Structure formats: structure tokens, C-alpha cells
Amino acid sequence: SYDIQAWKKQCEELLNLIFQCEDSEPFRQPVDLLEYPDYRDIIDTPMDFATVRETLEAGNYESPMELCKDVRLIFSNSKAYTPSKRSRIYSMSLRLSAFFEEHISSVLSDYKSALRFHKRN
Ligand SMILES: NCCNC(=O)N1CCN(C(=O)c2ccco2)CC1
Incomplete structure (x- = not known):
């Protein structure tokens, strides 16, 4: 499995699964500050699954490691x-x-394996 580009569709499919999980509903969109007035006092860098999906679809992740960090x-x-x-x-x-x-x-393992195969010689 040495496809260097395969991570992107694999991450799209995983985000679809996450959007089907009831557990994801609080983390799909930003925090309304009228409901959580102190949120940005405690948290430096807001992140939500809609932001991750949009970043992926924009072509603004270079690797699945960057998506995993977000x-x-x-x-x-x-x-x-x-x-x-x-x-x-x-x-x-x-x-x-x-x-x-x-x-x-497996998405991380397969990508890192593909990049090592690319540099093998
Ligand atoms: N449409 C919902 C948008 N997001 C949102 O309101 N929250 C999700 C992130 N939050 C927490 O992780 C958390 C931990 C304990 C209490 O809240 C704050 C509430």
C-alpha cells in the first residue's frame, strides 16, 4: 500500500463516520460565547470538525499528521x-x-510507509 495520496479520501471517510456519531454533535461547530462566556479565556485555539473538514477539502493539509494534530x-x-x-x-x-x-x-502507518517507499533508493 504505497499510495502517497490515499490518506486524504481515508480521512474524508473517517470524518463522515464521525459526523454520523451522536457523540460528535457538540464538536461539529464553534462554541457560542452567549452560552459559554468564559470559553476563550481558557482556550487559545478553537477547533471543530467542520473546520477540519473544510481545511482538508481546501487542500490545506499536507499530511494526515497535520489533520490528526487538529x-x-x-x-x-x-x-x-x-x-x-x-x-x-x-x-x-x-x-x-x-x-x-x-x-x-492505519491511515498514519500507511502514509508513513508510502513516503519511506518513495525514498527507498
Ligand atoms: N454546537 C455546540 C458548539 N460547541 C459547544 O458549545 N461546546 C463544545 C465544546 N465544549 C466542551 O468541550 C465542553 C467540555 C465541558 C463542557 O463543554 C463547550 C461546549
Whole structure:
């Protein structure tokens, strides 16, 4: 599996699966500050799944590592903002993070393998 470009459709399919998960609904769009007035006091760099999908479709990721860094930021923002490790929305973040890590592992491995094959000689 040495296709250097295959990660992009694989990440599109994984984002589609994430958009079918009920657990993703809080993380699809930005935080309304009328509902969470302190959000930008606590969080430096907002990220949501619609921003990741748009960045991908714009051709503004060079690698699946860059996409993975932005998805992990969604989850670290939730852990940072949560007032409790027993919150509803933080709990949804942890399930969705486990699902995402289970599926992104092969996408990263296959891409890095393809890049090593490209430089083999
Ligand atoms: N359409 C919803 C847009 N997003 C949104 O309102 N939130 C998701 C991100 N947040 C959290 O990760 C979090 C952790 C504990 C409580 O909230 C704040 C709320």
C-alpha cells in the first residue's frame, strides 16, 4: 500500500463516520460565547470538525499528521474547558477520541510507509 495520496479520501471517510456519531454533535461547530462566556479565556485555539473538514477539502493539509494534530486539539480543548472530568460533553469527547484513534492508526502507518517507499533508493 504505497499510495502517497490515499490518506486524504481515508480521512474524508473517517470524518463522515464521525459526523454520523451522536457523540460528535457538540464538536461539529464553534462554541457560542452567549452560552459559554468564559470559553476563550481558557482556550487559545478553537477547533471543530467542520473546520477540519473544510481545511482538508481546501487542500490545506499536507499530511494526515497535520489533520490528526487538529482533531487532537478538539479533544484537548474539551479536557481543558470541562469544569468536571464527569461532565456529559467531556465524556462524549473521550468516546469519540477512542473511536478516532482506533481508525487513524492505519491511515498514519500507511502514509508513513508510502513516503519511506518513495525514498527507498
Ligand atoms: N454546537 C455546540 C458548539 N460547541 C459547544 O458549545 N461546546 C463544545 C465544546 N465544549 C466542551 O468541550 C465542553 C467540555 C465541558 C463542557 O463543554 C463547550 C461546549
